[PDB]
Amino acid sequence: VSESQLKKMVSKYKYRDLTVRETVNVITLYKDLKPVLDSYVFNDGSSRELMNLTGTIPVPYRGNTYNIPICLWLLDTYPYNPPICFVKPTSSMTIKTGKHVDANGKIYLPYLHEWKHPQSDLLGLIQVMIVVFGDEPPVFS
């Protein structure tokens, strides 16, 4: 919440402004998404404080709207690099591994494989996630 607090959690980001703006443009359309500062321990064990967007996104399916929970991670430099998406399934959700989701929850979409920064953004990434998830549900009660 607040734009000031947002510019504080991303003070160690090479491209603050950009990130911020983009973030503001995201939470703006998807209020179900809120920024948070947490430590991301890579597989190598290393750790780093990055800002991710935790929450849920609306994905209409069979006339029903499912609020699939995701967690986008931004690296000190997410203005040119693709965020680390993840499907955080609840105790009442079962990951349906497919072409855009594995057993760990990792998300796979052409938008990430071909990420640039001049045309690629969070908003665009989220919108594309709703379109793909709409045709292919990564989870099922």
């Binding site: 597989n43 064990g45 105790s91 594995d102 929850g105």
Partner: protein, 76 residues
């Protein structure tokens, strides 16, 4: 369910645990397969360090899931 565990050398191990299995228990299973002391094992899922006081369902770990194992006592 069945899960996978990758190492730092490039070795994958398969284990059969249950959603009600604690991480401490998972460490023991790995100590019986590889012989790595639980006190010298670091599990990581989705970039998150699992605790020995939590279970698998607590982390939302489904089947065919992949976990990372890190050994301690080498650097800092």
């Amino acid at each position: 369910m069945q899960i996978f565990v990758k190492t730092l050398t490039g070795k994958t191990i398969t284990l059969e645990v249950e959603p009600s299995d604690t991480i401490e228990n998972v460490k023991a299973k790995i100590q019986d397969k590889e012989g790595i002391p639980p006190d010298q094992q670091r599990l990581i899922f989705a970039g998150k360090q699992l605790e020995d006081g939590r279970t698998l369902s607590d982390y939302n770990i489904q089947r065919e899931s992949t976990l990372h194992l890190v050994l301690r006592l080498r650097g800092g």
